[PDB]
Amino acid sequence: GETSVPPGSALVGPSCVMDDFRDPQRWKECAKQGKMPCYFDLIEENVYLTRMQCECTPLEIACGEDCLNRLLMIECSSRCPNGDYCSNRRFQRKQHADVEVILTEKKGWGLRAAKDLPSNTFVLEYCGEVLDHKEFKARVKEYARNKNIHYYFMALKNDEIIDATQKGNCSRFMNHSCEPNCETQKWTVNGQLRVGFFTTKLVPSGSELTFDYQFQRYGKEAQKCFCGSANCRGYLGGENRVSIRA
Ligand SMILES: CC(C)C[NH2+][C@@H](CC[C@@H]([NH3+])C(=O)O)C[C@H]1O[C@@H](n2cnc3c(N)ncnc32)[C@H](O)[C@@H]1O
Ligand SMILES: [Zn+2]
Ligand SMILES: [Zn+2]
Numbered sequence: 498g499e500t501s502v503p504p505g506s507a508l509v510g511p512s513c514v515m516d517d518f519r520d521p522q523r524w525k526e527c528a529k530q531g532k533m534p535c536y537f538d539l540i541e542e543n544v545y546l547t548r549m550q551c552e553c554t555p556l557e558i559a560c561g562e563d564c565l566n567r568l569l570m571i572e573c574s575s576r577c578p579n580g581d582y583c584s585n586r587r588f589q590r591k592q593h594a595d596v597e598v599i600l601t602e603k604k605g606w607g608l609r610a611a612k613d614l615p616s617n618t619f620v621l622e623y624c625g626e627v628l629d630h631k632e633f634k635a636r637v638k639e640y641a642r643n644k645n646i647h648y649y650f651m652a653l654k655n656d657e658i659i660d661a662t663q664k665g666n667c668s669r670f671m672n673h674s675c676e677p678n679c680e681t682q683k684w685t686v687n688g689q690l691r692v693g694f695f696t697t698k699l700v701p702s703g704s705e706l707t708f709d710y711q712f713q714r715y716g717k718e719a720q721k722c723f724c725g726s727a728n729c730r731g732y733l734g735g736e737n738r739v740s741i742r743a
């Protein structure tokens with residue numbers, strides 16, 4: 498039939514907002530109604546189970562692209578020459594991009610840009626429980642036995658795996674794309690390695706934020722990939738990195 502501009506529609510039961518992730522009672526209400534994802538423990542920094550001073554002239558960006566710390570993926574300290582105005586303390590100040598959580602047709606929940614994000618914009622820290630090999634192997638078996646639909650593991654370093662299944666932040670919702678618009682970067686903050694999502698191109702407002710989910714991509718089992726990209730590899734998992742054998 499003939500289509501028309503719809504009338505203005507207001508909700509009656511108030512809509513769920515991003516600040517409701519810091520409000521457990523409202524979140525659990527919204528989740529029952531399917532207006533928010535299943536509850537998890539929102540954490541501000543990683544939970545463990547088991548010097549560097551730039552030459553930036555005090556200030557049009559304070560500790561911009563030429564900052565000797567930034568160049569090595571090291572954050573500045575409170576002693577930075579630019580003091581409070583240092584732009585290279587993003588993890589410490591939790592200077593996350595403007596993001597919104599969305600419900601996708603096929604992949605579950607996801608993350609979208611709420612503003613245009615330039616290339617190499619800090620999106621969010623990937624926070625979770627930091628697991629040793631033993632705990633990781635146990636939880637892999639635990640999650641497999643429970644038939645978990647989604648995975649939230651990310652390697653931090655060769656002996657440490659972040660698990661955001663139970664505890665983390667909204668970065669846990671990031672979905673895989675075969676042609677992604679974000680990457681992870683591992684930054685040193687007060688001597689401790691932390692991992693965050695960063696855009697790899699200009700991401701326009703309203704676009705889903707996506708990454709190459711390496712943990713699953715190179716794992717043994719596979720699943721249908723719903724990324725929709727022009728050169729989608731068809732499935733996620735069961736792949737090996739390039740090698741030249743024999
Ligand atoms: C390490 C973190 C960032 C990993 N974050 C989850 C998001 C779950 C979130 N959607 C939800 O609802 O809580 C990955 C899982 O999401 C699914 N997922 C993603 N991208 C898919 C694709 N392109 N095709 C199919 N499933 C795809 C898959 O199960 C993956 O393990
Ligand atoms: Zn600097
Ligand atoms: Zn600085």
Ligand SMILES: [Zn+2]
Pocket residue numbers: 674675676722723724725726728729730731732
């Ligand atoms: Zn794909």
